[PDB]
RNA sequence: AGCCAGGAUGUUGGCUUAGAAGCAGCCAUCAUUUAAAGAAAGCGUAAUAGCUCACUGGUCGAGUCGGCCUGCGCGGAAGA
């Protein structure tokens, strides 16, 4: 969004033509892409000043500037439409004229992310440090939490189909999944696994209950995506390295016995292009 | 000939100044004069202009055959005008008119703003469409073709500056 | 403009006009069919 | 009827619902819902035993409209429907196999006489004799 | 020679039909109407939709066109 030909209103209104979705954007644009200084958040109706030097400094919020006093007018009225047709209860105060505050509208739109009919769009620059400090506050209010979602849903081991919503807190049997299982010349196999709920201690007979194998839980290590930091006590929701698995496949469980059990491998791919390596 | 069977009818609203070889046409919005060659015999006879090739210059059927086509365009150019629209197809390329100056967003490290001479009232409805208006048929092309020569039609994408009625022939990569 | 001693009217719509004295042959869509000498 | 916009007569055996895209660009000319030309003709296609190419023409109109003319199958494929094989023209004047007299040719011309104003009876008779000689077929009465 | 201008329409033109559907190529090489149309020239192209040649069917309303022979001319023609 600091480039030529970068029209914000075109692309979000191009999704309604090609992708066929319903995007209603929120953070609009101020500046002719080279003297660009403001990103127009429309709920609080505030433009944000960014850095000039000293690569990250300011977050200065001001009002809507005078050069865009009418485009903020005709686009805020479509924002406050987006709760009257999200929940049925905001239908009668769009027309009655109860005030549509910043805090009231998000309580409907957050429930519009569990069905995913609208996506929330934001223009800005990553590299020019214009928008990155803005983009974080929507994540806690428009992206869902592991305790706000439907949690771990184990079904059974065999038989009928009883899908069971388990708890997202620490008060459940342990559960995780195995993915991004990288390698290393130190210990051999590594993982980038994420635990959904429950707490594990250090040292466990973690099995892989889909393929009938016994494994033991070694010294777990966390990263800054690069550096070895030994995570001993893994809390519910961290992402770490389930180390020392003897055999492990794509997406099987990491679970103590006498507990719920998953058995799920969906969309196993097909590597297509085949070249023959020779020594 | 066909040109000898082609006389031109001047209408009311455009005045001729026949000082023999030098004709200065007093028109609607300008003064479209051409100082022709001496291979012509000019006469605004009654209303419809009649011409003639001079003796010795018997190749003046060509040299006044230019002239018969010439002055017809001049009396209709000073009054009505030429719409000469150009189509800017360039990634991040814009066009905007101010006074008599055109910007050229042309993918360079520096802007190109060239001033355009008299006989031009330029306009720009958008960043990709640009009007040019003028009275001479020569000047309505000469200022247009200079822009097009700065970025010729690229026959691998369709990139470039191109006329409204001009249709390029874009090819395909075919190797990689 | 390719040069060769022979200007042969090759493409189906090939104009020929004598610009400056040296003949160069004018196609429409084919740039490959344009010679200049002879 | 109409003029330089569009006029092509192309349809093949109507047992195939899909528009068969050596025909498809004749349906890919002026913006049709291809389901409409599938739903127009099938009300009368259940009065036939399929297997022969039946022809229709396309003709167009301003906004999104179109039209089409139904006729009977031509006698050229009716020559090679009775003869068993659909393609006999390997050598025209060197093959002498297969006879049908004029009586078959006129009764497949009454269905032309009850459908179309050209392709008349007596004039086509030499060309239904002319499509016989190119295929290498004989005729006697 | 240009602007209107139908490209009158039997047909899918086979083969071998996977498309070789007038437009890859070998044998036929008729024409229902002949005041305008060939079982056919390229481009669009796997095939075709798009655009023409075909007759210019209606307008301009006069000359015009392709080759044979010679008088001379241009290119071909770059050196220390």
Swiss-Prot record, chain B:
Organism listed in the record: Escherichia coli (strain K12)
Protein's name according to its UniProt entry: Large ribosomal subunit protein uL6
SUPFAM superfamilies documented for this protein: Ribosomal protein L6 (SSF56053)
Family assignment from sequence similarity: Belongs to the universal ribosomal protein uL6 family.
GO CC annotation, single: cytosolic large ribosomal subunit
One GO BP annotation of this record: ribosomal large subunit assembly
InterPro entries: Ribosomal_uL6-like (IPR000702), Ribosomal_uL6-like_a/b-dom_sf (IPR036789), Ribosomal_uL6_a/b-dom (IPR020040), Ribosomal_uL6_bac-type (IPR019906), Ribosomal_uL6_CS (IPR002358)
Alphabetic keyword roster: Acetylation, Antibiotic resistance, Ribonucleoprotein, Ribosomal protein, RNA-binding, rRNA-binding
One term of GO molecular function: structural constituent of ribosome
Matches recorded under Pfam families: Ribosomal_L6
Cited function: This protein binds directly to at least 2 domains of the 23S ribosomal RNA, thus is important in its secondary structure. It is located near the subunit interface in the base of the L7/L12 stalk, and near the tRNA binding site of the peptidyltransferase center. Gentamicin-resistant mutations in this protein affect translation fidelity.
Domain of life: Bacteria
Record-linked PROSITE patterns: RIBOSOMAL_L6_1 (PS00525)
Coiled-coil positions: none
Subunit text: Part of the 50S ribosomal subunit.
Name of the gene encoding the protein in the UniProt record: rplF
Post-translational modification N6-acetyllysine, affected residues: 43
Curated annotation (Swiss-Prot), chain C:
Keywords recorded for this protein, A-Z: Ribonucleoprotein, Ribosomal protein, RNA-binding, rRNA-binding
Function: One of the last ribosomal proteins to be assembled in the 50S subunit, it contacts a number of helices in the 23S rRNA, acting as molecular glue. The simultaneous presence of uL16 and bL36 probably triggers ObgE's GTPase activity and eventual dissociation from the mature 50S ribosomal subunit.
Species for this entry: Escherichia coli (strain K12)
InterPro entries tied to this protein: Ribosomal_bL36, Ribosomal_bL36_sp
The protein's name: Large ribosomal subunit protein bL36A
Lineage, top ranks: Bacteria, Pseudomonadati, Pseudomonadota, Gammaproteobacteria, Enterobacterales
A cellular component term, taken from the record's GO annotations: cytoplasm
Gene giving rise to this polypeptide: rpmJ
GO BP field: cytoplasmic translation; translation
One Pfam family named in its UniProt record: Ribosomal_L36
Keyword RNA-binding part of the UniProt annotation: yes
Family to which the UniProt record says this protein belongs: Belongs to the bacterial ribosomal protein bL36 family.
SUPFAM superfamilies in the cross-refs: Ribosomal protein L36
Assembly mode: Part of the 50S ribosomal subunit.
Example GO molecular function: structural constituent of ribosome
From Swiss-Prot, chain D:
GO cellular component, one term: cytoplasm
UniProt modified residues of type N6,N6,N6-trimethyllysine: 3, 39
Example GO molecular function: rRNA binding
PTM sites of type N,N,N-trimethylalanine: 1
Residues with PTM N6-succinyllysine: 71, 80
Pfam families: Ribosomal_L11, Ribosomal_L11_N
Keywords: Methylation, Ribonucleoprotein, Ribosomal protein, RNA-binding, rRNA-binding
GO biological process, one term: ribosomal large subunit assembly
UniProt cross-references to InterPro entries, sorted A to Z: Ribosomal_uL11 (IPR000911), Ribosomal_uL11_bac-typ (IPR006519), Ribosomal_uL11_C (IPR020783), Ribosomal_uL11_C_sf (IPR036769), Ribosomal_uL11_CS (IPR020785), Ribosomal_uL11_N (IPR020784), Ribosomal_uL11_N_sf (IPR036796)
PROSITE patterns: RIBOSOMAL_L11
Family annotation (Gene3D superfamilies): Ribosomal protein L11, C-terminal domain (1.10.10.250), Ribosomal protein L11/L12, N-terminal domain (3.30.1550.10)
Subunit text: Part of the ribosomal stalk of the 50S ribosomal subunit. Interacts with L10 and the large rRNA to form the base of the stalk. L10 forms an elongated spine to which 2 L12 dimers bind in a sequential fashion forming a pentameric L10(L12)2(L12)2 complex.
Family: Belongs to the universal ribosomal protein uL11 family.
Role summary: Forms part of the ribosomal stalk which helps the ribosome interact with GTP-bound translation factors.
NCBIfam families registered for this protein in UniProt: L11_bact
Protein name per UniProt: Large ribosomal subunit protein uL11
Organism: Escherichia coli (strain K12)
Gene from which this protein is expressed: rplK
């Amino acid at each position: 969004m600091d480039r030529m030909g970068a029209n914000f209103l075109k692309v979000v209104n191009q999704i309604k033509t090609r992708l066929g979705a319903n995007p209603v954007p929120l953070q609009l644009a101020i500046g002719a892409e080279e003297h660009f200084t403001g990103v127009v958040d429309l709920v609080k109706m505030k433009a944000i000043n960014w850095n000039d030097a000293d690569q990250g400094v300011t977050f200065e919020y001001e009002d809507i500037p005078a050069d865009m006093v009418e485009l903020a007018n005709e686009w805020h009225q479509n924002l406050i439409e987006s709760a009257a047709e999200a929940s049925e209860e905001l239908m009668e105060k769009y027309l009655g004229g109860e005030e549509l505050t910043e805090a009231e509208i998000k309580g409907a739109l957050r429930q519009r992310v569990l069905n995913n009919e609208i996506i929330l769009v934001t223009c800005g620059s990553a590299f020019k440090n214009k928008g990155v400090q803005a983009m974080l506050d929507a994540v806690i209010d428009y992206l869902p939490s592991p305790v706000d979602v439907p949690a771990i849903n184990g079904i059974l081991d065999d038989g009928k189909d009883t899908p069971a919503e388990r708890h997202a807190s620490d008060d459940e049997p342990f559960s995780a999944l195995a993915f991004k299982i990288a390698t290393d010349p130190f210990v051999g196999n590594l993982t980038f696994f994420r635990v959904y709920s429950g707490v594990v201690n250090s040292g466990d007979t973690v099995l892989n209950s889909v393929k009938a194998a016994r494994e033991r839980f070694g010294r777990i290590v966390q990263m800054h995506a690069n550096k070895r930091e030994e995570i001993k006590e893994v809390r519910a929701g961290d992402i770490a390295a389930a180390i020392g698995l003897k055999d492990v496949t794509t997406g099987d469980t990491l679970c103590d016995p006498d507990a719920p059990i998953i058995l799920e491998r969906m969309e196993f791919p097909e590597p297509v292009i085949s070249i023959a390596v020779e020594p | 000939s066909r040109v000898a069977k082609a006389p031109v009818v001047v209408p009311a609203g455009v005045d001729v100044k026949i000082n023999g070889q030098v004709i200065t046409i007093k028109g609607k919005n300008g003064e479209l004069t051409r100082t022709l060659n001496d291979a012509v015999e000019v006469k605004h006879a009654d209303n419809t202009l009649t011409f003639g090739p001079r003796d010795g210059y018997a190749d003046g059927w060509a040299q006044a055959g230019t002239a018969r086509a010439l002055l017809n365009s001049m009396v209709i150019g000073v009054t009505e005008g030429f719409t000469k629209k150009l189509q800017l197809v360039g990634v991040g390329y814009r066009a905007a008119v101010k006074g008599n100056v055109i910007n050229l967003s042309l993918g360079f490290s520096h802007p190109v703003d060239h001033q355009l001479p008299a006989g031009i009232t330029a306009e720009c409805p958008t960043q990709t469409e640009i009007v040019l208006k003028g009275a001479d048929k020569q000047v309505i092309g000469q200022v247009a073709a200079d822009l097009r020569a700065y970025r010729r039609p690229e026959p691998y994408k369709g990139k470039g500056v191109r006329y409204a009625d001009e249709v390029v022939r874009t090819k395909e990569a075919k190797k990689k | 403009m390719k040069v060769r001693a022979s200007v042969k009217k090759l493409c189906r719509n090939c104009k020929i006009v004598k610009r400056d004295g040296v003949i160069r042959v004018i196609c429409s869509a084919e740039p490959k069919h344009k010679q200049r000498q002879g | 009827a109409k003029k330089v916009q569009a006029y092509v007569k192309l349809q093949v055996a109507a047992g195939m619902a899909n528009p068969s895209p050596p025909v498809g660009p004749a349906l890919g000319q002026q913006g049709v819902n291809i389901m409409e030309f599938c739903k127009a003709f099938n009300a009368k296609t259940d009065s036939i035993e399929k297997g022969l190419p039946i022809p229709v023409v396309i003709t167009v109109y301003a906004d999104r409209s179109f039209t089409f003319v139904t006729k009977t199958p031509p006698a050229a494929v009716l020559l090679k429907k009775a003869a068993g094989i659909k393609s006999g023209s390997g050598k025209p004047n060197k093959d002498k196999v297969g006879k049908i007299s004029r009586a078959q040719l006129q009764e497949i011309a009454q269905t032309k006489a009850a459908d179309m104003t050209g392709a008349d009876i007596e004039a086509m008779t030499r060309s239904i004799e002319g499509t016989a000689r190119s295929m290498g077929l004989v005729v006697e009465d």
